[PDB]
Amino acid sequence: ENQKLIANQFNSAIGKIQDSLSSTASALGKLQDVVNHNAQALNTLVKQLSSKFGAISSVLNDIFSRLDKVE
Amino acid sequence: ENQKLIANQFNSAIGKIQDSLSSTASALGKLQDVVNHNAQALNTLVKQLSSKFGAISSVLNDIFSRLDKVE
Amino acid sequence: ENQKLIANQFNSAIGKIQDSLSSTASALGKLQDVVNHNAQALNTLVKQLSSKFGAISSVLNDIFSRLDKVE
Amino acid sequence: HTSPDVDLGGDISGINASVVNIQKEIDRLNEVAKNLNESLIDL
Amino acid sequence: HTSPDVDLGGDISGINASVVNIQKEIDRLNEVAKNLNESLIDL
Amino acid sequence: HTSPDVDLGGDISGINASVVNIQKEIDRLNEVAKNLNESLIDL
């Protein structure tokens, strides 16, 4: 009878730990997807910012060139 | 006696696994708070960058307009 | 004999839960390293962006000053 | 002719950052950490 | 009159990114993964 | 003399964001959640 109690409560504990491991797996999966998304987004921001700032550089350069042409 | 050993060590194991699940819960909670903070921050950066760059656009536009007025 | 079965399967379950806790520890460690890297990167981006935009501010200011000098 | 509008470059509005919602899983972990007391053996 | 100072827009200094410190929890998980060997049954 | 090239400031290309790959650990967690059924006691 005590063996039946140990077996039943061990089966219950293993079921609950299975649920906990499935929950931890799902949570780490969502965290992975989100952190990777944000990383790709920050990398895209870095690259396209580099592009836009280079464009701004060229624009200001032509600005200063026109100014020198005037003066 | 062997049943008492099994019961005691199973109780110890379940206590340690309770501590581990509480630690995993706290860790995932902190990771969630931090990743969400960083996501909101990156979104704020994106929006306010869009604003500042639009402003720069208007400014350079007026610049070029004044230049054309001169030349 | 049933006690030997309970003991063997409990040892197997504790071994598998040890593997699962080691995997969760490694996963949270990698997530921590990556989220902290991305946070430092976003902070660096914020600071150096502030710098570049201040520079752009000064440049446009001198631009407008030269313009006023012309006109 | 006058100068055209300056196209400063890419449209940074396309960038966006998702938001992770794992409160279900964290709450489940805490619920299990509390329910494992219903599985302790008491001979 | 001369042109005023250009206000390029928002003050991006307000943006900031936190840093997660879960080394306590990771160390606790490894400590438990090592201490579960003190709970293996040996009849 | 003409004006020099404007150095807009820092070289933002040095910034970069890593990518976390914990699919090994997530797959191991699911494999263990499936293998714990081989450890349930059936007297």
Burial F4-26 (b: 16+ CB within 10 A, else e): eebebbbebeebebbebebeebb
Residues with Cβ < 8 Å from A17, sequence gap 6 or more? B17, C17, D32, D36, F36
User: Are the Cβ atoms of F22 and C26 closer than 8 angstroms?
Assistant: yes
The packing angle between helices C2-70 and E23-35, to 10°, is 160
Q: Quick one: resolution in A?
A: 2.8
Structure tokens at A70: 């005037």
Within a 10 A sphere around the Cβ of C3, how many other Cβ atoms?
15
Minimum distance, in Å, between the CA of residue B29 and any CA atom of chain E: 10
Nearest in space to E11 (alpha carbons), one of D11, B62, C54, F12: C54
User: Are the Cβ atoms of B30 and E6 closer than 8 angstroms?
Assistant: no
Spatial contact of F3 and C65, defined as CB atoms under 8 Å apart = no
Residues with Cβ < 8 Å from A57, sequence gap 6 or more? F6, F8
Experimental method: cryo-EM
User: Are the Cβ atoms of B21 and D36 closer than 8 angstroms?
Assistant: yes
Question: How far apart are the C-alpha atoms of A68 and D19, rounded to whole Å?
Answer: 50
> To the nearest 10°, the Cα dihedral for A15, A17, A20, A24?
-130
DSSP state for residue D39 in the 8-state scheme: S
Q: Give me the residue from C9, C28, C59 closest to A60, CB to CB.
A: C59
Backbone phi, psi, residue F15, to 5°: -65, 145
Minimum distance, in Å, between the CA of residue E1 and any CA atom of chain B: 15
Question: How far apart are the C-alpha atoms of A35 and D19, rounded to whole Å?
Answer: 9
Tally of domains in chain F: 1
Domain that holds residue E3: 1-43
Spatial contact of D8 and B56, defined as CB atoms under 8 Å apart = yes
Question: How far apart are the C-alpha atoms of B66 and D15, rounded to whole Å?
Answer: 33
